[PDB]
Design a protein around this motif. Structure first.
Motif, short mmCIF file in Angstrom:
data_model
loop_
_atom_site.label_atom_id
_atom_site.label_comp_id
_atom_site.label_asym_id
_atom_site.label_seq_id
_atom_site.Cartn_x
_atom_site.Cartn_y
_atom_site.Cartn_z
N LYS A 1 0.87 -1.22 0.00
CA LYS A 1 0.00 0.00 0.00
C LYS A 1 0.88 1.24 0.00
CE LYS A 1 -0.41 -1.47 4.37
NZ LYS A 1 -0.09 -2.81 4.96
N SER A 2 1.86 1.30 0.87
CA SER A 2 2.75 2.49 0.90
C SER A 2 3.27 2.73 -0.52
CB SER A 2 3.93 2.22 1.83
OG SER A 2 4.70 3.41 1.97
N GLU A 3 3.52 1.68 -1.25
CA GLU A 3 4.01 1.84 -2.64
C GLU A 3 2.96 2.60 -3.44
OE1 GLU A 3 6.61 0.10 -5.03
OE2 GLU A 3 7.48 1.30 -3.46
N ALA A 4 1.71 2.27 -3.28
CA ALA A 4 0.65 3.00 -4.03
C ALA A 4 0.63 4.45 -3.56
CB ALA A 4 -0.71 2.35 -3.78
N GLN A 5 0.91 4.67 -2.30
CA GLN A 5 0.92 6.06 -1.77
C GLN A 5 2.07 6.81 -2.44
OE1 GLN A 5 -0.66 5.95 2.76
NE2 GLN A 5 -0.11 7.77 1.68
N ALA A 6 3.13 6.11 -2.76
CA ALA A 6 4.29 6.77 -3.42
C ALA A 6 3.85 7.35 -4.76
CB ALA A 6 5.40 5.75 -3.65
N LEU A 7 3.01 6.64 -5.45
CA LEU A 7 2.52 7.13 -6.77
C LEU A 7 1.40 8.15 -6.58
CD1 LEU A 7 3.20 3.82 -7.04
CD2 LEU A 7 3.07 4.63 -9.40
N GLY A 8 0.96 8.32 -5.36
CA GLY A 8 -0.13 9.30 -5.10
C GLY A 8 -1.44 8.55 -4.86
N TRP A 9 -1.55 7.84 -3.77
CA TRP A 9 -2.80 7.08 -3.49
C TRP A 9 -3.32 7.45 -2.11
CZ3 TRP A 9 -1.86 2.85 0.25
CH2 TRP A 9 -3.05 2.34 0.78
N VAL A 10 -4.59 7.72 -2.00
CA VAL A 10 -5.18 8.04 -0.68
C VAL A 10 -5.63 6.73 -0.04
CG1 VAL A 10 -6.89 9.41 0.52
CG2 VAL A 10 -5.95 10.21 -1.65
N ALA A 11 -5.30 6.50 1.20
CA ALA A 11 -5.71 5.22 1.84
C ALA A 11 -7.24 5.14 1.93
CB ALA A 11 -5.11 5.12 3.24
N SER A 12 -7.93 6.20 1.58
CA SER A 12 -9.42 6.16 1.63
C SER A 12 -9.91 4.84 1.02
CB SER A 12 -9.99 7.33 0.84
OG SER A 12 -11.21 6.94 0.23
N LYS A 13 -9.11 4.24 0.17
CA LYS A 13 -9.51 2.96 -0.47
C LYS A 13 -10.66 3.20 -1.44
CE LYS A 13 -10.42 1.16 3.35
NZ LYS A 13 -10.03 -0.02 4.18
N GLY A 14 -10.76 4.37 -2.00
CA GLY A 14 -11.87 4.64 -2.95
C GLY A 14 -11.31 5.18 -4.27
N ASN A 15 -10.01 5.12 -4.45
CA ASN A 15 -9.42 5.63 -5.71
C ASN A 15 -8.03 5.01 -5.92
OD1 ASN A 15 -8.71 7.63 -3.38
ND2 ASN A 15 -7.07 7.77 -4.81
N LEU A 16 -7.80 3.84 -5.39
CA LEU A 16 -6.47 3.19 -5.57
C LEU A 16 -6.19 3.03 -7.06
CD1 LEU A 16 -4.01 2.23 -4.73
CD2 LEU A 16 -4.97 0.07 -3.94
N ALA A 17 -6.98 2.22 -7.71
CA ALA A 17 -6.79 1.99 -9.17
C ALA A 17 -6.90 3.32 -9.94
CB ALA A 17 -7.87 1.03 -9.68
N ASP A 18 -7.34 4.37 -9.29
CA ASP A 18 -7.47 5.68 -9.99
C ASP A 18 -6.09 6.35 -10.09
OD1 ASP A 18 -9.00 7.45 -11.33
OD2 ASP A 18 -9.34 8.72 -9.63
N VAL A 19 -5.29 6.25 -9.06
CA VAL A 19 -3.94 6.88 -9.10
C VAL A 19 -2.90 5.83 -9.51
CG1 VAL A 19 -4.64 8.48 -7.32
CG2 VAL A 19 -3.61 6.29 -6.70
N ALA A 20 -3.26 4.58 -9.44
CA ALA A 20 -2.30 3.50 -9.82
C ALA A 20 -3.08 2.30 -10.36
CB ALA A 20 -1.49 3.08 -8.59
N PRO A 21 -3.76 2.50 -11.46
CA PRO A 21 -4.57 1.45 -12.09
C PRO A 21 -3.69 0.25 -12.47
CG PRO A 21 -4.66 3.57 -13.39
CD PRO A 21 -3.77 3.80 -12.16
N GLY A 22 -4.29 -0.87 -12.75
CA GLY A 22 -3.49 -2.08 -13.12
C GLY A 22 -2.42 -2.33 -12.05
N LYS A 23 -2.82 -2.44 -10.81
CA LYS A 23 -1.83 -2.68 -9.73
C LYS A 23 -2.50 -3.44 -8.58
CE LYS A 23 1.92 0.38 -10.35
NZ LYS A 23 2.07 1.85 -10.53
N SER A 24 -1.72 -4.03 -7.71
CA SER A 24 -2.32 -4.78 -6.57
C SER A 24 -1.51 -4.50 -5.30
CB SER A 24 -2.29 -6.27 -6.87
OG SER A 24 -3.60 -6.71 -7.21
N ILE A 25 -2.09 -4.72 -4.15
CA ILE A 25 -1.35 -4.47 -2.88
C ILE A 25 -0.91 -5.80 -2.27
CG2 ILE A 25 -1.42 -3.08 -0.81
CD1 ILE A 25 -2.20 -1.43 -2.91
N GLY A 26 0.36 -6.07 -2.24
CA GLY A 26 0.83 -7.36 -1.65
C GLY A 26 2.30 -7.22 -1.22
N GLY A 27 2.78 -8.14 -0.42
CA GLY A 27 4.19 -8.06 0.04
C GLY A 27 4.26 -7.31 1.37
N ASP A 28 3.18 -7.27 2.09
CA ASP A 28 3.19 -6.56 3.40
C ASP A 28 3.41 -7.56 4.53
OD1 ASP A 28 2.46 -3.75 2.72
OD2 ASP A 28 0.86 -4.80 1.73
N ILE A 29 4.10 -7.17 5.56
CA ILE A 29 4.35 -8.10 6.69
C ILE A 29 3.03 -8.44 7.38
CG2 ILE A 29 5.31 -8.25 9.00
CD1 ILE A 29 7.29 -8.80 7.06
#
Length: 110
Positions: free
Chosen positions: A27-55
């Motif tokens: 998720k922090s990675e998506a925030q790097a590209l400009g993603w709000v954790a609101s979880k309502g526009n993830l694919a909007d600032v980083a479309p074609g992407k997934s959140i994984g690799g978190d401890i």
């Protein structure tokens, strides 16, 4: 266009390439590209992407592990809209537990 984002599908890509998909940025990675954790526009600032690799310290505790050990989590199922509650948990011993309720349930697959 065509990737792997499921429980058995991600479990396969895991024991296959021994590494989350190239489209699994935490998720922090998506925030790097400009993603709000609101979880309502993830694919909007980083479309074609997934959140994984978190401890996975086991905020609840339902995976075959103990103190000192650490688990790994990955996003399971994801297309468009608010994030989902499906995610998988792979451990260092290749223990894969899928959850379809947000770490609220775990099934041993691969």
């Amino acid at each position: 266009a065509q990737v792997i984002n499921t429980f058995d599908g991600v479990a396969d890509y895991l024991q296959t390439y021994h590494k989350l998909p190239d489209n699994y940025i935490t998720k922090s990675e998506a925030q790097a590209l400009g993603w709000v954790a609101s979880k309502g526009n993830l694919a909007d600032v980083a479309p074609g992407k997934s959140i994984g690799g978190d401890i996975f310290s086991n905020r609840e505790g339902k995976l075959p592990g103990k103190s000192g050990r650490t688990w790994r989590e990955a996003d399971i199922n994801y297309t468009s809209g608010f994030r989902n509650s499906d995610r998988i948990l792979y451990s260092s011993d290749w223990l894969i537990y899928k959850t379809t309720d947000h770490y609220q349930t775990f099934t041993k697959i691969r």
